[PDB]
């Protein structure tokens, strides 16, 4: 299990080894010259968008990240242990694929709200 | 009972994607630099013992016929051939009124009019002087302009380039590797017919070395099947689609150009040199290829058995030679030792199969000016090769076309034809595909962020 | 999207003259060859003429027809001359799967709508 | 109010919409003109990201600090800054005395650097 | 005082000025394209280091100590003298062999904390 | 007035013979001459 | 009426008006193109 | 060099000498063969 | 790894024809010149011939020999003609340190193993 090896293992099992996936995300003019550079630049852009998207939520380099936004029932409406001891990530991405963007906007709302509350609590004293 | 979303990063999920793949080449050829048309000097070295790691319990759907990494491999070879020819001579002053006569240096009855001995005027190092020079040209590269005055075949359309006599057409393996954030999934399933799920799949750093061999019928030096002969076609019932056949055990083909050709230098002008053909030493003989009658017949026996699965147990399978058309599709075209062959495969594909020691000598012809498959326009001129050519190669598959016939015929006739070069590498990239890694999956858990 | 559009529309008498045109839209012109096929009523498709880097003509042509391609407009033009009565058929335009011309219909993957020349 | 609509709104009103500008800072004649444009965007993103990192706040988007505010720079009522006046007008007013603040803001995290890894050492 | 100015000074003085080096880690023709390769490389090297920090227990700290115990075999000497008499350049040569195994120790220690925090916040 | 910052109490080893960045200067000057002569006119007609 | 400096006659004046006014330009000749083969792959498009 | 004559086919008065009928040798696809061709040129594009 | 490999040599009657060769493997051919040095038994190395962009010959050649370079295979030849009996020696191949040729032995840095020509 060196990279993506936990794809078929359970979401609980796969989530135990995430740093393996994290590390393999940044590693005369000739035809291969441009194709190499276009590869190197593309990797940087995709890596920095995920970090930025995590940053605007309440977790930057946490790699396991809890939030204050509730789990709307309609998204999955199924018991917890089922989706952690009997299902893999690839199947799970299909169930909520339509609902990823709506959750992302909610996470932005809760983080900006959380920041000022932290700011205000440092001013009254 | 309350539940909140949780964010997980570094999560294994992927999705089929389109991207640019770069080259990786083994360092065994780094020494003795020379130069290649595929320019693997700039190709980054590959990593030894790459991370070929299996993925369990994962089912992934492949489709070799609409696969990516074949269209963009097609462009790479086209563009890789273009920058190789850019810095090389332009034979614009080469086609003028020639004065050719037949070669009669103890020729054989097969090679009667196939060689012409031509003489022409060419500028010396000074632009104020001309001189008469002569060279030997094949019959396929000249036309009459009447008489015994000729011109080169392909300079009333375009002009030809001389492949620098250092670039080496010999193919070398090429590994196509994806960038960070992308992975290549390889199908390990034995009975993989090009489409559908592949229950045995793995992910690799990047593909095995794939030697790009340009060839029509009888694609050579490719990858072999695992335990049976595989017939893969986009749609069997459609006669207009090709049939890519890959058999496990190779059958050896020995192709030679017996003529002991010599190389001569003719000065086009100041700083320009043209590599001509001097007088041929020894005897004249047609080029030819050799395959075993036993090995070829057993291989066709395996192919017919597999063809009955998709066509019927009680069916007559018939083989016939090429339908007819352009020379680069009616014959086995390939490149051997820097020279271009056109072999008549009528002796291989002629048989009928009922449901219930010696070799095959198939003659070949040579050309010097070739219409490149890269474009309908520009050609190129292959300089002569010193000595006697001889190369042994593996036949690893076929490209077939089924003759269209009405129902109730009970006799399916297949013809050979290569045509598109995308099929040459579609036979090697059928295993692979590209996906983009998509971390940041959101799931709920019984946890709340601290306030 | 690859598509082929024909022209000509022959209604000429014996010993006439025409010029069929076929434009290639959704693909590169200098990457494929194009050929003309013919279907007399109650018969099968036959090869008439085609040209990639080299022109080829059918046996019944006998040097009457002539093919050419203008890469500027991405068209292939078929001259027609000395039209005998037996030429009455539907002339189809097809694009080859490669740069090379065959005489069998298995070598082409896209076909024109058709033109009935009588 | 999709990218910069709060440009003319009051400073206090503009701080509600901060993630909106954040996500938009990172998203062959034209072959190189497109290539060079993408690298420049990445470098500018990391310059301000690293500049925040050297201070004690990297992924915060609002960050307090231990640096007293010199009255010389502003000398104006706090009410009117967030209730009448805008980030556009403010960047011009502070424009003169701004590069001083960046240096001091590094000192406070340097003063915390003088204090961070000693409390855990003496525990 | 400037970039690498404290290179020849001991570790204790070197750690005083760590931001001076941090700042200077990111800052058609055959001269410009030589710059493009240089400009892409700078971010690539910078991001590799930052990603390595993130998977450990520190993202932008600039000082970061861990709960993995120091194996005496690596150094075998007094704390009071390495920080008052040794420079960083000398230290790298000795610990170079005992490196890339320490990195794995740092990688594992952070993941378990992330799960323990996941576990701790669930039992409330 | 480039910031030439003196590094004190530190020793460094040098070797000008196996040094790189002269091979880079050699390759630079060759390439800089190559593109300087690209737009220039050739003298092929003068061979009379 | 837009001008960088209306009093400096050396500065051009740009006019932009509301309703466009139509202009019909034609070349009445029925021109025939002739192709001449300069050389290999070279064609000169003359006028017949 | 061009041998040119005025084109006059019941030409309109406004076009008394606007067009020229020029003839000249030209090189073919074979270097050692020449060809005589002609073209029509506007007066503004030719100089006597 | 710059390595020099040679050929040629062996007996030939006086007035005969011999051709020597020496190829360059580990470095660019169009960046360095080549030279031929011969060491008679008991004597010291003396310049024979060498070509960069210009051919140079030793004072004893008297126009008999001829040096050329073929960039295609990066080899330098030496067409020996009218070989007198005083030419017998061990002939070395040397790569110059630049594009220019020097008659001295220390203008070159890589040497061949040797080849006796008698
Ligand atoms: C393709 O076409 C070219 C040109 O047509 C041929 O090249 C010529 O081939 C002929 C025939 O072999 C050559 O003629 C031969 O030349 C030999 C060399 O001597 C010549 O040169 C010396 C100076 O070096 C002169 O003094 C001398 O007069 C010759 O001109 C001769 O030795 C040959 O003699 C043969 O014939 C005589 C009778 O005439 C006999 O007595 C001899 O014993 C001997 O059999 C002969 O004359 C000619 O030199 C070639 N070059 C040219 C420029 O013409 C190619 O051979 C041809 N290639 C093929 C494959 O067909
Ligand atoms: C299919 O694969 C086989 C092998 O996997 C391959 O056979 C190879 O063919 C090439 C060319 O025909 C061979 O290379 C030649 O080898 C001979 C010795 O046998 C040499 O003398 C040759 O040297 C000449 O060419 C060089 C390159 O131009 C020159 O530098 C030199 O001076 C000589 O002029 C040449 O290197 C190669 O040895 C075989 N390999 C094997 C294992 O047989 C076959 O060609 C492939 N088929 C196709 C269609 O590509
Ligand atoms: C400029 O000069 C051109 C040269 O003649 C003029 O073209 C002429 O246009 C008329 C009107 O369309 C045509 O008359 C028709 O001809 C068709 C048959 O023509 C077929 O064959 C020609 C051969 O070239 C082909 O080009 C056509 O497309 C057809 O396939 C009849 O069926 C019609 O009934 C009608 O008679 C002329 O044939 C055509 N001339 C030539 C030589 O083709 C053009 O009109 C002139 N323009 C102006 C503005 O004056
Ligand atoms: C460039 O040159 C080639 C070869 O000369 C041209 O192809 C040839 O064109 C001629 C046309 O004059 C063809 O001749 C024709 O033959 C038929 C009989 O098949 C006859 O009935 C016609 O009257 C005509 O004479 C010839 O077949 C054809 N092919 C060959 C191998 O010669 C080519 O056309 C030239 N390029 C262009 C753009 O025309
Ligand atoms: C816009 O264009 C006007 C021109 O209409 C500029 O005004 C001109 O400014 C020049 C400045 O050198 C004046 O030149 C001066 O002329 C007097 C004689 O009258 C001479 O004694 C001085 O030594 C100097 O050369 C010029 O007279 C003046 N002309 C007018 C009509 O105003 C104006 O500067 C331009 N720019 C702007 C922003 O208006
Ligand atoms: C431009 O000048 C050229 C060359 O002088 C002209 O070409 C020639 O034009 C004549 C008619 O003007 C063409 O027909 C010939 O007429 C004579 C009259 O006696 C007749 O005897 C011939 O049998 C022939 O029918 C002639 O074919 C043509 N020659 C060529 C090579 O094209 C051209 O007409 C002039 N055009 C203009 C617009 O001024
Ligand atoms: C390019 O042109 C130059 C100049 O002509 C050529 O150099 C010349 O090469 C010839 C032999 O090919 C030399 O002739 C010999 O000269 C010696 C002198 O002692 C004589 O003894 C021999 O019998 C023979 O005649 C000639 O000297 C030499 N030029 C000079 C100035 O030394 C060169 O070979 C040409 N290169 C090519 C590739 O054609
Ligand atoms: C290649 O294999 C796949 C799967 O093994 C075949 O797909 C199925 O084919 C059967 C019969 O041909 C159909 O009834 C199924 O509906 C197909 N499955 C799907 C998902 O479409 C495919 O037909 C095979 N191709 C060939 C040419 O034999
Ligand atoms: C291909 O097979 C043919 C057999 O017909 C070979 O031709 C024979 O080669 C031998 C070898 O010396 C000769 O003795 C015979 O005279 C040749 N003719 C016949 C009829 O046997 C040919 O050499 C083979 N070529 C290759 C490349 O294998
Ligand atoms: C390929 O070779 C075959 C022979 O095996 C050629 O077919 C022969 O052609 C001649 C020419 O008229 C006929 O007389 C024979 O009867 C044919 N024999 C067979 C078995 O077909 C064929 O022509 C060759 N291919 C080409 C393109 O010339
Ligand atoms: C033709 O195929 C054979 C086997 O299909 C190849 O022989 C194998 O080559 C690989 C790599 O060179 C070796 O690891 C195997 O041990 C070989 N097996 C056998 C049975 O020889 C051969 O290299 C291919 N090419 C040619 C020209 O024969
Ligand atoms: C290099 O050596 C000099 C000489 O010993 C060092 O200077 C000493 O620095 C310490 C630091 O506090 C002072 O306490 C000593 O008094 C200094 N020595 C003298 C003689 O004044 C210097 O620190 C060393 N390192 C560098 C980078 O210069
Ligand atoms: C364009 O409009 C601007 C502002 O409406 C004009 O600028 C002012 O013009 C008045 C009268 O012309 C001057 O008194 C002011 O000093 C100008 N102010 C500035 C800042 O330049 C400008 O003149 C107009 N230009 C034109 C050509 O109409
Ligand atoms: C051909 O065209 C030229 C260019 O217009 C004519 O030259 C002029 O002709 C007019 C009318 O005779 C004279 O008044 C001018 O003096 C001429 N100009 C020159 C510079 O001489 C010429 O006359 C025309 N010839 C024919 C035969 O049409
Ligand atoms: C090409 O142009 C030349 C020069 O104009 C023509 O050659 C001679 O021209 C003069 C004057 O026009 C005539 O008196 C001669 O009779 C021409 N020579 C010949 C051999 O006819 C030539 O005619 C033109 N055409 C070609 C095809 O060369
Ligand atoms: C595949 O599934 C089986 C049964 O659900 C399970 O025992 C096995 O661990 C799974 N594979 C992996 C790699 O976890
Ligand atoms: C979730 O609820 C269903 C309801 O029938 C039950 O069968 C299942 O066992 C539950 N999940 C787990 C993990 O027990
Ligand atoms: C080859 O041709 C030559 C003519 O140049 C002839 O003398 C010789 O006899 C021929 N070879 C054989 C084997 O007949
Ligand atoms: C030359 O060979 C041709 C074969 O194409 C033949 O027709 C001709 O008679 C032979 N002889 C001459 C003198 O052309
Ligand atoms: C295969 O081709 C036949 C006829 O050409 C057609 O009826 C059938 O739908 C095709 N199959 C697919 C999967 O497109
Ligand atoms: C410390 O290093 C020694 C070898 O130098 C090794 O045997 C021992 O297991 C290591 N202990 C730890 C806790 O890393
Ligand atoms: C005018 O000249 C044109 C040129 O082709 C000709 O067709 C036409 O008949 C002429 N008309 C008269 C009235 O001369």
Residue numbers in the entry:
A (entry chain B): 520 to 546, 567 to 664
B (entry chain G): 32 to 141, 150 to 185, 188 to 309, 312 to 321, 321A, 322 to 398, 411 to 505
C (entry chain J), I (entry chain L): 1 to 52, 55 to 82, 82A, 82B, 82C, 83 to 100, 100A, 100B, ...
D (entry chain E): 520 to 546, 569 to 664
E (entry chain A): 520 to 546, 568 to 664
F (entry chain C): 80 to 127
G (entry chain F): 272 to 309, 312 to 321
H (entry chain F): 128 to 141, 150 to 183
Give excerpts from the publication.
Antibody CAP256-VRC26.25 targets the second hypervariable region (V2) at the apex of the HIV envelope (Env) trimer with extraordinary neutralization potency, although less than optimal breadth. To improve breadth, we linked the light chain of CAP256V2LS, an optimized version of CAP256-VRC26.25 currently under clinical evaluation, to the llama nanobody J3, which has broad CD4-binding site-directed neutralization. The J3-linked bispecific antibody exhibited improved breadth and potency over both J3 and CAP256V2LS, indicative of synergistic neutralization. The published structure of the super-potent antibody CAP256-VRC26.256 in complex with a prefusion-closed envelope trimer reveals that the light chain of this antibody does not interact directly with Env, leaving its N terminus free for conjugation.
We mixed CAP256V2LS-J3-3 with BG505 DS-SOSIP.664 trimer at a 3.5:1 molar ratio for cryo-EM grid preparation. As expected, a single CAP256V2LS Fab was observed to bind at the apex hole formed by the three protomers of the trimer, as observed previously for the CAP256-VRC26.25 Fab in a complex with Env trimer. Clear density was present for the linker connecting CAP256V2LS light chain N terminus to the C terminus of J3 binding at the most proximal CD4-binding site. At each of the other two CD4-binding sites of the trimer, J3 was observed to bind, with weak density extending from its C terminus, but the linked CAP256V2LS was not visible. The linker density was mostly missing at a higher contour level, indicating that the linker for these two molecules was flexible. At this contour level, the density for the constant domains of CAP256V2LS bound at the trimer apex was also not visible, and only its variable domains could be seen. Binding of J3 generally recapitulated the binding mode observed for J3 alone, as did the CDR H3 of CAP256-VRC26.25; however, the variable domain swiveled, so that the C terminus of the heavy chain was displaced almost 16 Å. Overall, the structure confirmed the ability of the CAP256V2LS-J3-3 to bind simultaneously to both V2 apex and CD4-binding site, with two other copies of the bispecific antibody binding through only their J3 moieties to the other two CD4-binding sites of the trimer. We attribute the lower efficacy of scFv fusion to the larger size of scFv versus nanobody; the substantially smaller size of the nanobody likely enables it to reach the CD4 binding site, while simultaneously allows recognition at the V2 apex site.
